[PDB]
Amino acid sequence: DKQIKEIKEVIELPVKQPKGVLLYGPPGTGKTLLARAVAHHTDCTFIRVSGSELVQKFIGEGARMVRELFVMAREHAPSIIFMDEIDSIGSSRLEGGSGGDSEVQRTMLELLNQLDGFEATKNIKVIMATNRIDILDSALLRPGRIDRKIEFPPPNEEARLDILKIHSRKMNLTRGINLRKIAELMPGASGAEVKGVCTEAGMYALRERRVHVTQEDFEMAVAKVMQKD
Amino acid sequence: CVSNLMVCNLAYSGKLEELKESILADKSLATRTDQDSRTALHWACSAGHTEIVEFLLQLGVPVNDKDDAGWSPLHIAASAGRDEIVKALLGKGAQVNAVNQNGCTPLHYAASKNRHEIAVMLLEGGANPDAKDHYEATAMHRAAAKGNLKMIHILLYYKASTNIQDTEGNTPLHLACDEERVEEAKLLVSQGASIYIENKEEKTPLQVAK
Amino acid sequence: DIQKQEVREAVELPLTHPPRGVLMYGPPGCGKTMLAKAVAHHTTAAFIRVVGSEFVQKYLGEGPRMVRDVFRLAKENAPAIIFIDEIDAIATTGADREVQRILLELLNQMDGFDQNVNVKVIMATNRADTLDPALLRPGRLDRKIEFPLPDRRQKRLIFSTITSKMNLSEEVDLEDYVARPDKISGADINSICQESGMLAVRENRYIVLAKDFEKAYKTV
């Protein structure tokens, strides 16, 4: 609740002006679960850039769509823009990682200058996600005129008690479960291990034909996601 | 009718008196070759008839006749699952380490389904526990792959090496980690299997196992 | 062994009672019909079998109406295990790109149907180099099930799953017959065992041996 709670008064404020937001941390999970789960609670579309192959041919053939993406975002007035593919530890050379990453940092520079320039419809938002010296390059490029700053903690234990609580309200759970050792037995590298123990443990709760998920089942799915890790 | 030769179908079908009357009537029938380059001894070892192969070995049929694919009557008898036929062929002096076209020995096919009697009787006659085919693969790959831990142990009675590298470079410990048999992995590691030896995939047995 | 159990627990266990996208792959093994028919026998429901290139025509508005009507009888009558074959051909040519964006349209229409919904979307292919990265994105196709052909392990696993169905003598070998493909490149080991059934089906011999394994290796 520490991420969705801080994110509600920014995302859901023009729903029921902030220009952008950045998310820093180890390349685990929570950059797309928050943008797409809260974009899903917004009931808005999810427009991705995702600079890679087959996207310069699939979505537009010769269009950088730095304004045409705001035309698709103009017709799709409720929308959330988020960078997901570029968040990788591969852009660490600071020359081609900072040039190839600087094309998208420039893209969001002119995008933040379009949102600051004018508005055709509300709810327009951009969400950043990077973890490198490029973060300090963005702090050199953001002269701090139009931008929103929200702290995004790494997937630590405090980022697992609350994501295990929020991601445990969806399905049934017993009251006699200890919410500390099961959070500590799922170390690093994502929160999708927690969501894989929850969601992949519901299949064992249905297999055992139990109405509620027990702690031994969460431990079993911990062992099952740790055999895959 | 397994083949065009009548006496081979009599050897497979178990016609004892008709095969005795047929070969006693014509001695050439025992040594005749079919399209598969097999004789009555080969098919009779496939079916596992004792008195037929004892009449053929009584007359003096060659014990190591190989077919087009290289299958000797010991490959087919030890690969058939008949202890008495292996007793007769080893009694007559069959090659304990004969090789077929692909290069396997009857010890390997005996070790496939964990045949203890044929393994102890072939290895007792002078078989090679570390015998290798053209594909560099001893019987411990069957023993650890197919879950035959008792074949691992009785091959270790005859001092079989635990670190024969395959054509890819995997020791039999990797194939023990194939079936996820933890007893075979721990028992082989304890008995002297080297986890440090890697294949061309540069993977240890602990990294391949889940 | 693991393929019929992964597809089985991924299709029929969630069927009447959490993945739903069962993607069948494996270019060596023909496959893709033994499991569609095996599902067509184990489960008694409506099956709309579609070879894939069945709705590629002049029309453009008829496609969505066809998948929406087949999806209304699938969504209305029973958990249709509708089998879509050969998505690699229609996943890349304005008609093919047209059923590519159509393919992402129906992939979004199953995205609205997250899971445990009335009906199920299984899928089959044999070429992954032409598949879009958005197709295999998690949440859409959560099960990437292969046809047992990787040389090291699943070759022996498919030897076990093909020896569990057909007859077997103790002459069935694995060392020379899985290390021979390691030296010389070969495919469809399962279909070569089927060829050994096509050379032992001559009614001469009653139990299959390795002479048709190595003879099938040298002939086909």
Side-chain angles (χ1 to χ4, degrees), chain C residues 22-64:
Chain C
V22 171
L23 183 60
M24 289 183 282
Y25 188 64
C30 185
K32 292 189 284 185
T33 308
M34 293 185 287
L35 294 176
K37 288 180 177 179
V39 163
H41 283 284
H42 291 88
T43 57
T44 62
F47 297 102
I48 308 299
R49 52 193 68 188
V50 282
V51 195
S53 181
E54 88 272 5
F55 67 110
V56 177
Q57 281 90 236
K58 299 178 290 294
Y59 293 163
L60 57 95
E62 187 66 27

Side-chain angles (χ1 to χ4, degrees), chain C residues 71-121:
Chain C
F71 270 166
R72 86 175 294 273
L73 57 93
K75 270 260 89 184
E76 199 268 333
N77 195 1
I81 317 172
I82 289 163
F83 164 72
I84 300 169
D85 194 1
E86 293 180 353
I87 69 164
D88 62 341
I90 62 172
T92 300
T93 62
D96 209 79
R97 180 178 169 86
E98 204 272 333
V99 297
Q100 180 186 6
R101 91 246 291 151
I102 280 179
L103 182 66
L104 194 141
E105 181 184 359
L106 60 94
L107 185 63
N108 199 0
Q109 288 179 357
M110 74 173 288
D111 282 329
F113 293 159
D114 300 322
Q115 221 266 329
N116 290 326
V117 95
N118 200 167
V119 80
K120 299 289 180 66
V121 182

Side-chain angles (χ1 to χ4, degrees), chain B residues 27-130:
Chain B
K27 299 289 185 180
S28 67
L29 293 172
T31 60
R32 285 183 185 271
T33 180
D34 57 355
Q35 297 177 359
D36 292 331
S37 179
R38 275 189 170 182
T39 62
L41 185 62
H42 296 86
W43 297 102
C45 288
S46 178
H49 294 289
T50 297
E51 194 68 27
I52 283 91
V53 306
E54 285 180 353
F55 186 76
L56 288 169
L57 291 169
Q58 183 177 2
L59 266 70
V61 65
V63 72
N64 291 315
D65 286 334
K66 292 181 182 291
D67 61 355
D68 291 330
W71 291 92
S72 69
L74 188 61
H75 286 84
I76 311 163
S79 187
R82 303 294 183 269
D83 297 331
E84 186 66 28
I85 315 298
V86 178
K87 292 180 183 180
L89 297 179
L90 289 177
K92 296 284 103 175
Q95 289 181 356
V96 296
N97 294 116
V99 292
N100 42 3
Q101 183 178 1
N102 53 11
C104 294
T105 64
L107 178 66
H108 289 89
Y109 299 104
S112 177
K113 290 293 182 182
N114 207 168
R115 293 291 183 269
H116 299 88
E117 295 87 4
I118 311 169
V120 173
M121 290 173 189
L122 283 173
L123 284 168
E124 182 67 28
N128 192 1
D130 292 330

Side-chain angles (χ1 to χ4, degrees), chain B residues 2 34-38 43 67-71 100-102 109 135, chain C residues 171 173 176-177 180 184 189 191-202 204-205 208-220:
Chain B
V2 293
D34 57 355
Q35 297 177 359
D36 292 331
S37 179
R38 275 189 170 182
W43 297 102
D67 61 355
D68 291 330
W71 291 92
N100 42 3
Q101 183 178 1
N102 53 11
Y109 299 104
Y135 307 103
Chain C
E171 191 164 353
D173 191 355
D176 53 358
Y177 298 159
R180 184 179 181 273
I184 49 99
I189 297 297
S191 296
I192 293 170
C193 295
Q194 292 180 356
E195 289 294 328
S196 176
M198 292 179 184
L199 270 72
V201 79
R202 210 186 312 115
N204 289 326
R205 190 173 63 195
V208 63
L209 303 181
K211 287 184 70 172
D212 294 331
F213 288 164
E214 194 271 331
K215 184 174 174 66
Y217 276 164
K218 68 180 181 180
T219 54
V220 64

Side-chain angles (χ1 to χ4, degrees), chain C residues 155-171:
Chain C
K155 291 276 190 177
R156 286 185 173 93
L157 295 177
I158 201 171
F159 268 110
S160 67
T161 203
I162 197 63
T163 204
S164 296
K165 296 294 289 184
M166 295 178 186
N167 299 115
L168 67 98
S169 179
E170 78 172 8
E171 191 164 353

